[PDB]
Amino acid sequence: MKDKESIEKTRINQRVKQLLHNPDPKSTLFIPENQRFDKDFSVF
Amino acid sequence: MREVISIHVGQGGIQVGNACWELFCLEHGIQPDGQMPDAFNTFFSETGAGKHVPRAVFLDLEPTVIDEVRTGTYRQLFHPEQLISGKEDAANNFARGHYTIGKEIVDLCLDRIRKLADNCTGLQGFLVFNSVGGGTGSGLGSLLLERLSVDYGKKSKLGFTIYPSPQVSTAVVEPYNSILSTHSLLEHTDVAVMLDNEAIYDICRRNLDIERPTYTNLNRLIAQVISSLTASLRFDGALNVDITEFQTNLVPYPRIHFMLSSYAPIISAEKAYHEQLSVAEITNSAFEPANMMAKCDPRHGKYMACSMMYRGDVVPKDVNASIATIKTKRTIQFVDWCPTGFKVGINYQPPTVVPGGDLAKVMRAVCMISNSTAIAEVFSRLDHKFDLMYAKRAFVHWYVGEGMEEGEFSEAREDLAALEKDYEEVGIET
Amino acid sequence: MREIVHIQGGQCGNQIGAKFWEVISDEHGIDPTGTYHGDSDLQLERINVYYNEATGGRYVPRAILMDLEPGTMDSVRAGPFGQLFRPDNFVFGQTGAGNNWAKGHYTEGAELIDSVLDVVRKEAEGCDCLQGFQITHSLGGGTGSGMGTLLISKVREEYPDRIMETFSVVPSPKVSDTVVEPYNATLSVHQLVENADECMVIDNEALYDICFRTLKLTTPTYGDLNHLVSAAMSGVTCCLRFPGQLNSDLRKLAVNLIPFPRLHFFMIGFAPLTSRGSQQYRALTVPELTQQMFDAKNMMCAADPRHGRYLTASALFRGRMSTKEVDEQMLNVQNKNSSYFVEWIPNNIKSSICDIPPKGLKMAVTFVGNSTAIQEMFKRVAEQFTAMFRRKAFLHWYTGEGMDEMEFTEAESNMNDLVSEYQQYQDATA
Amino acid sequence: MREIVHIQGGQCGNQIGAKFWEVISDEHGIDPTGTYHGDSDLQLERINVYYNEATGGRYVPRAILMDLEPGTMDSVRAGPFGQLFRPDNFVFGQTGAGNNWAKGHYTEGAELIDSVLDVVRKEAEGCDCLQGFQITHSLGGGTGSGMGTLLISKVREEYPDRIMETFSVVPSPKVSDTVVEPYNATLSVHQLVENADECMVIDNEALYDICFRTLKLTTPTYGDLNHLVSAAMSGVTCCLRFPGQLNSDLRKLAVNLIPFPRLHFFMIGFAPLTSRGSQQYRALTVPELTQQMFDAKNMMCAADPRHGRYLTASALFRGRMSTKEVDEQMLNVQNKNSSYFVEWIPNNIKSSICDIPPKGLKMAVTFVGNSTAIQEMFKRVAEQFTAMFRRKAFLHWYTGEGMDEMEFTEAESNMNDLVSEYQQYQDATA
Numbered sequence A: 001m002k003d004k005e006s007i008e009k010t011r012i013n014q015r016v017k018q019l020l021h022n023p024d025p026k027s028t029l030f031i032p033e034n035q036r037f038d039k040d041f042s043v044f
Numbered sequence B: 001m002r003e004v005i006s007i008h009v010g011q012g013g014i015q016v017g018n019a020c021w022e023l024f025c026l027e028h029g030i031q032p033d034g035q036m037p038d039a040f041n042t043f044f045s046e047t048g049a050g051k052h053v054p055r056a057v058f059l060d061l062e063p064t065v066i067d068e069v070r071t072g073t074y075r076q077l078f079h080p081e082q083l084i085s086g087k088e089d090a091a092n093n094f095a096r097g098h099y100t101i102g103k104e105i106v107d108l109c110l111d112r113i114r115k116l117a118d119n120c121t122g123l124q125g126f127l128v129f130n131s132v133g134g135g136t137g138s139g140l141g142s143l144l145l146e147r148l149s150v151d152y153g154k155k156s157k158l159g160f161t162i163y164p165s166p167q168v169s170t171a172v173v174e175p176y177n178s179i180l181s182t183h184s185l186l187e188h189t190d191v192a193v194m195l196d197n198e199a200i201y202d203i204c205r206r207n208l209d210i211e212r213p214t215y216t217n218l219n220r221l222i223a224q225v226i227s228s229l230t231a232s233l234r235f236d237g238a239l240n241v242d243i244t245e246f247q248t249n250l251v252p253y254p255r256i257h258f259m260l261s262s263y264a265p266i267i268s269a270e271k272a273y274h275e276q277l278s279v280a281e282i283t284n285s286a287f288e289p290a291n292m293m294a295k296c297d298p299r300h301g302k303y304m305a306c307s308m309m310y311r312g313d314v315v316p317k318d319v320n321a322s323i324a325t326i327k328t329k330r331t332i333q334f335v336d337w338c339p340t341g342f343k344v345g346i347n348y349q350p351p352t353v354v355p356g357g358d359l360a361k362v363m364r365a366v367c368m369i370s371n372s373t374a375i376a377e378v379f380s381r382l383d384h385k386f387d388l389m390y391a392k393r394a395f396v397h398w399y400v401g402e403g404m405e406e407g408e409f410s411e412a413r414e415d416l417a418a419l420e421k422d423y424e425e426v427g428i429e430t
Numbered sequence C, D: 001m002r003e004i005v006h007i008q009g010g011q012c013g014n015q016i017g018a019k020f021w022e023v024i025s026d027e028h029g030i031d032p033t034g035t036y037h038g039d040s041d042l043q044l045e046r047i048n049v050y051y052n053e054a055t056g057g058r059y060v061p062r063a064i065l066m067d068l069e070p071g072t073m074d075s076v077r078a079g080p081f082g083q084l085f086r087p088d089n090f091v092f093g094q095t096g097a098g099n100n101w102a103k104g105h106y107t108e109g110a111e112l113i114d115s116v117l118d119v120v121r122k123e124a125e126g127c128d129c130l131q132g133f134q135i136t137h138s139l140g141g142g143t144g145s146g147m148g149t150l151l152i153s154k155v156r157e158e159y160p161d162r163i164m165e166t167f168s169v170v171p172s173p174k175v176s177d178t179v180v181e182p183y184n185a186t187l188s189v190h191q192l193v194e195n196a197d198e199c200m201v202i203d204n205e206a207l208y209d210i211c212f213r214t215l216k217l218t219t220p221t222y223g224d225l226n227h228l229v230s231a232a233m234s235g236v237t238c239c240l241r242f243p244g245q246l247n248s249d250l251r252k253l254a255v256n257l258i259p260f261p262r263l264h265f266f267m268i269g270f271a272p273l274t275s276r277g278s279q280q281y282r283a284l285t286v287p288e289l290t291q292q293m294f295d296a297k298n299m300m301c302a303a304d305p306r307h308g309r310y311l312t313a314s315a316l317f318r319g320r321m322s323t324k325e326v327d328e329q330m331l332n333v334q335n336k337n338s339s340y341f342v343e344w345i346p347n348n349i350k351s352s353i354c355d356i357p358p359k360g361l362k363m364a365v366t367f368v369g370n371s372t373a374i375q376e377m378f379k380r381v382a383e384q385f386t387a388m389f390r391r392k393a394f395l396h397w398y399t400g401e402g403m404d405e406m407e408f409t410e411a412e413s414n415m416n417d418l419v420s421e422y423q424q425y426q427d428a429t430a
């Protein structure tokens, strides 16, 4: 700050589709094939 | 269980929406990718695992700004199909964006609004941003407000419109569509806040000491004001205020809901820490006429009601001791039929700083939303500008040929005359 | 137990089956060599529904493939999973029909059909408990629309108590590939109403619209349309091959979706469907499935379902989910859309839950709704038929093989009577 | 999206285009072989505005070249960047017009124009969303001023809602190269006012004056005049091909610069322009750009802009700069020169900012102002026309091809009426 113009200087410085069966691993939708068979909403 | 949806239409609206959405993401700790490395629920929604999606929609007929948004660092944040874009711009013609090309786009926007609203359970209201002096902005804002007022009814809508400066102007035809849009939102919006660029330029020059500002510096201040207004919904506070608790405190009559804002303190890190920033001095600075966020003089009119928000470590007794001092001063006078005119809110979360920005980090801040009788001057000067060219019917052929009738200009003039008469009738003492 | 046999005819039906059987084999873990390589125990418990057992432990579909020309079956054999089909079931002629309905139903189709009926009788007499037959064919071709429909009558005459399914592709006027489509469409619809227990119309135009708008893929091909049709086909019989909270065979759907014996023309749709780039954004929930399920653009037909009122509806949920949510959502989708549901039959939506989801997906829904909006397809088909027939255009080809114009007049009259009496209940009130 | 096609006619227009396309290709980094070799990502995002895509990855301009003689197009092909033009778009006759307007508009130009209109229709029907057309031609020649203006009417008759640009070189009396210039200038101005949405006059005399006084180069040639005209042409559509703070397409300029439909004759100018020896002395700042922009000698026309009052003005800044400085400088240039700005339309200067500067320059400005001082050019043209016509000099050449003196009288009367009604607003007061 002692009479700085650096701030002024900085401004100067700037001058058959198969996506149904293949949802992305990231997505919520993807359930593993191995776990495809737990059939109980109760326990889960 | 409290939500709000923000609507951004036009180039200015999108460019201020970007400004507010860096700030919200920074304030809630969300990375630009949307991933965190229970207060977020007001602006965001949880997808079940991982990222957060903003409760915002971007509208424009001209594709350049949206394409810039969809390639920047925030490409992963927004849902891909809520950035509605057109092909042909309205080109500053109000009749285009209200009668010709906006009608074919408005249905998709309304479908998106419904799809976002069905997710919310405690919807507080809507926010809308639009620069008034443009074709698509004003026209689509008018059409969206008119559709929402009948689709939903009593839900509250807030408008952060940016009116043209008294003498500084970028277009040559902006008074026409400014007057028409004021006509449209006079009977359709619950709150309208004044935001002309010249006052904020003067604020930056005097306080921030920037001699060459750009639009980003203006939009950051507007974003800070929005954050200060909506902080009370997502942070714990000793004296809370909700959005629905406004028309009962700032709006004396249904017609009068245009008010002008101010913010304090505004100071750079190079000289911020040399002074103590007490609550009394910041609340004095907030009431200074030169720190109004719209280029209007409050000394030329009475006050009707003042709603002013604090945040940080402020104590209520210090707030009362400062409201008394302001009531004492002889240069600030309130209207006769309002003995007390202050609504005070106190929040604990200090304002957040954006890296590489202008403002420094402080522990106390104040944001005021004040309704005053002096606002009639901007209406009078816009009316005078409108009359000069409407006397010779200049530029009218660009509007008549886009489906608008000849008489539509006159009734907006009559409504402005009615508003100016109403403002004079209210301000006289009994 | 309660298994069904597969019979397909024509080129379009053969191409549909070539993907339907691939989907079924991938679902049950059967390699293209007929060897089981699955992971779960449930994959083998009810494999007798579609597959037979032979020595050496391999499995063979109980499908019958028929066409009047050998090219399509000589081509499907070289494709993936083409070796599963038993060579004995391939029956074909040496001449073809040339898209002429008369040739494929009176002169050539009559002599050949004895051989295919022999193998059909062999397959049905042997099986443990018959449930019924499902038929895939196209109404836009001669040999298919002739031989398939005559085979329908021959099968119905011998098994009057079994159930009969037909998945029929009708020629849309938008994407037309054959000039003589109206004649053999109108002639086929006449015979199809008298014998088929269930009929499901599918349109290429709706499939292209879905592929272009929902999946947003650049270059659709017949493989994608076939894959969508195959997924929809598999979704109907899923609970008959897997355990669930409320099992519902085909006969139970027949009871609950057909109010009167002549109103059995349904239009279907499959959910969810999302683009590759947006498959990570979306979260799979019952509300998200049900909002897409009743979407008008999601129907597999160009018929607009908000142009009429549903007589009844059905949904076959897949995956493990709570029943209370399903029932409340079904109630909500029926309270908010009371104008589009006929009022003299209350509670006209059937639901079912199967605990085994599709491979790769956690939840899926198949929708089968009987609506009055289907009248528009027969209206346009009859309009084109009467526009072409009044000049006796292309009539000599049909009349040179023993057919006359009287059978055309009777077919037109019966089709118009069907159109009228299908909408008779739309205006009916209690 | 919102792209435009290029159409040029005559020798002068072909020579202007031969440099305009070179400038555009150098700006977008396209080699003379049609292969992209650019450095920045933005160089390819909006390349569909001017260039089409063909197999092999090369780009081809959507330009149409027409002339009544083959020499000029046979010469432009051998020049640099001459291979980009598609050979199919070259249309020419075997006779020529001989600077006779009647031959190029009634007898020869009428029969040939069907072929060029065919390719024009092919180009326009195909493109994604049409923005409009831009036309380059000279008013001092016969074939150009005839065929181009008749093509203007033919295009306007088929696309009444699109926008139309014309860059027209009018014959100055100082540097005269053809004796029959007044006749075909006066005849062309009659038709040009009725159909062109925008017109931009350019004079060779002003170009020589600029080259001799500002650039101070010893030997001007047509290549320098063409380069200046090309830079001015490119400056107008820069923000339509690049992002910026305030995008403004051609239609937005049309709305803001034309008060009445018959007042659409602008004069332009480009800044900065400095000599080779003084390019190191000067410092590029917004004040330096704006002081040269409004300089009288910098206009591309000999018309003296301080002999009249501006109806409106426009500026298209290029490069990254602060908007506050631009607005304050525009206000200052309007407060210090209030005598030269019409008083009944306040705030009559439009500004726009584009963040992409020209290659090799850090800042640039394109100026388009509608002023009343343009009357002097039509006055002198009509003076020469009436001096030559009163003796019926050279009239037989025109009257031998079906034209009569009545069309000369009507053209003179309409031109004089335009001159009068253009200055009518100069003396108008509020």
Ligand SMILES: Nc1nc2c(ncn2[C@@H]2O[C@H](COP(=O)(O)OP(=O)(O)OP(=O)(O)O)[C@@H](O)[C@H]2O)c(=O)[nH]1
Pocket: B009, B010, B011, B012, B013, B015, B016, B062, B089, B090, B091, B092, B093, B131, B132, B133, B134, B135, B136, B137, B138, B162, B164, B169, B170, B171, B174, B197, B215, B216, B218, B219, D245, D246, D252
């Ligand atoms: N505060 C602020 N105002 C802006 C900004 N950008 C444009 N404006 C204002 O908006 C007015 C014109 O409207 P724009 O937003 O630029 O354009 P538009 O609303 O999209 O309307 P169109 O011209 O049809 O595209 C100008 O007078 C500016 O004052 C911005 O970034 N910040």
Ligand SMILES: Nc1nc2c(ncn2[C@@H]2O[C@H](COP(=O)(O)OP(=O)(O)O)[C@@H](O)[C@H]2O)c(=O)[nH]1
Pocket: C009, C010, C011, C012, C015, C016, C099, C138, C140, C141, C142, C143, C144, C145, C176, C177, C178, C204, C222, C223, C225, C226
């Ligand atoms: N979904 C799908 N439809 C097809 C395919 N091949 C043909 N079609 C449709 O079938 C119709 C023609 O039927 P056609 O081949 O003449 O039947 P055929 O006379 O029994 O052989 C066309 O309108 C196509 O839309 C395919 O591979 N997939």
Ligand SMILES: Nc1nc2c(ncn2[C@@H]2O[C@H](COP(=O)(O)OP(=O)(O)O)[C@@H](O)[C@H]2O)c(=O)[nH]1
Pocket: D009, D010, D011, D012, D015, D016, D099, D138, D140, D141, D142, D143, D144, D145, D176, D177, D178, D204, D222, D223, D225, D226
């Ligand atoms: N800027 C520029 N002007 C030119 C050039 N060549 C000719 N002109 C102008 O065009 C006028 C003659 O036009 P002309 O060639 O007869 O047009 P045409 O009849 O359509 O072929 C002259 O007055 C010149 O000033 C050139 O290369 N550049």
Ligand SMILES: [Mg+2]
Pocket: B010, B011, B062, B089, B136, D247
């Ligand atoms: Mg815009």
